[PDB]
Amino acid sequence: STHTLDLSRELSEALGQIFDSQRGCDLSISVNVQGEDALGFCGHTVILTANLEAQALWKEPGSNVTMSVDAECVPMVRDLLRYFYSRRIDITLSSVKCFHKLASAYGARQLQGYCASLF
Amino acid sequence: STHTLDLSRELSEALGQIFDSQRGCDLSISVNVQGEDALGFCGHTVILTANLEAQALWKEPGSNVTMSVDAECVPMVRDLLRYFYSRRIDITLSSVKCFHKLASAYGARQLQGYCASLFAILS
Ligand SMILES: [Zn+2]
Ligand SMILES: [Zn+2]
Ligand SMILES: [Zn+2]
């Protein structure tokens, strides 16, 4: 009797693209690299607070957060933050070390255990 | 050699629960029945503007929108709005006509096509 229309497969890229746009943000994320603010991004608290992986970024709208990362892991930060939206992430043997360090530091427990397996 | 961690199966209910909570809204939706404001909901423009199905609700934060619906279709409005978040919707023979009317009037084109096809299957 019940029929379901299911277009939820579109959600991962719809949310990923919200991050990519950097429009309508309500959270500022500064990326500290050995004492200096090397990178910046903005976030959407409505999306981030719905995700247990992004608990380090659970703040009220209008807030500012500071992340600290090592120079070698800078090219992986954008991918980590997009993963908090899309809930999808591509990991290689050359990036596993950095994603394990980032996930441990920010308590993204699903990603942390996934990288640990690949070590 | 690439390995993909994919937890996107959680997205539908994570977004559905944002609508259910009615917290952190930036859009007011009034449902008008026969000239009177019968019921109300609040929305999240960050989620709605990312969805082509939710076109009729593409507004700037702080806006107020009014939806006119027939009295018989009032029990279906919550499910239509939740569908704009979750991208999942349950349709029965007793609800198909109301979802087809709502989808047509508000331009939810994927749902409109689905109701039209489902009706041919059920009857
Ligand atoms: Zn069937
Ligand atoms: Zn693998
Ligand atoms: Zn039809």
Author numbering:
A (entry chain A): 129 to 247
B (entry chain B): 129 to 251
From the paper:
The cellular glycoprotein LGALS3BP (galectin 3 binding protein, also known as 90K) is a secreted antiviral protein that has been identified by us and others to interfere with late steps of human immunodeficiency virus type 1 (HIV-1) biogenesis, resulting in poor infectivity of released virions. 90K is composed of a scavenger receptor cysteine rich-like domain of known structure, a BTB (broad-complex, tramtrack, and bric-à-brac)/POZ (poxvirus and zinc finger) domain, an IVR (intervening region) domain, and a C-terminal part without substantial homology to known protein domains. The resulting atomic models revealed tightly intertwined homodimers with the canonical BTB/POZ homodimer fold, consisting of both α-helices and β-sheets. As expected from the sequence alignment, the two BTB/POZ domains are structurally conserved, with a DALI score of 22.6 and root mean square deviations (RMSD) of <0.6 Å for pairwise comparisons of 119 structurally equivalent Cα atoms.
We have shown previously that a shortened version of human 90K-myc, comprising solely domains 2 and 3 [hu 90K(127–408)], is at least as active as wild-type 90K-myc. Since the individual BTB/POZ domains of both the human and rhesus macaque 90K proteins do not feature a similar oligomerization tendency, and given that a single amino acid exchange in the BTB/POZ domain of the short version of rhesus macaque 90K was sufficient to restore antiviral activity, we determined the structures of the individual BTB/POZ domains from the human and rhesus macaque 90K proteins. We expressed modified 90K BTB/POZ domains that contained three additional residues at the N terminus (aa 124 to 250; based on secondary structure predictions and comparisons with available structures of other BTB/POZ domains) in Drosophila melanogaster S2 cells and purified both proteins, which behaved as a single oligomeric species in solution, to homogeneity. We obtained crystals of the human protein that diffracted to 2.1 Å (crystallographic statistics are listed in Table 1) and crystals of the rhesus macaque protein diffracting to 3.3 Å. The structure of the human ortholog was determined by the multiwavelength anomalous dispersion (MAD) method as described in Materials and Methods. The human and rhesus macaque structures contained 1 and 3 homodimers per asymmetric unit, respectively. The experimental electron density maps of both BTB/POZ domains allowed us to trace the entire molecule comprising residues 129 to 250. Residue 142 (alanine in human 90K, valine in rhesus 90K), the mutation of which resulted in a gain of antiviral activity in the context of the short variant of rhesus macaque 90K, is located on helix α1 and participates in the homodimer interface.
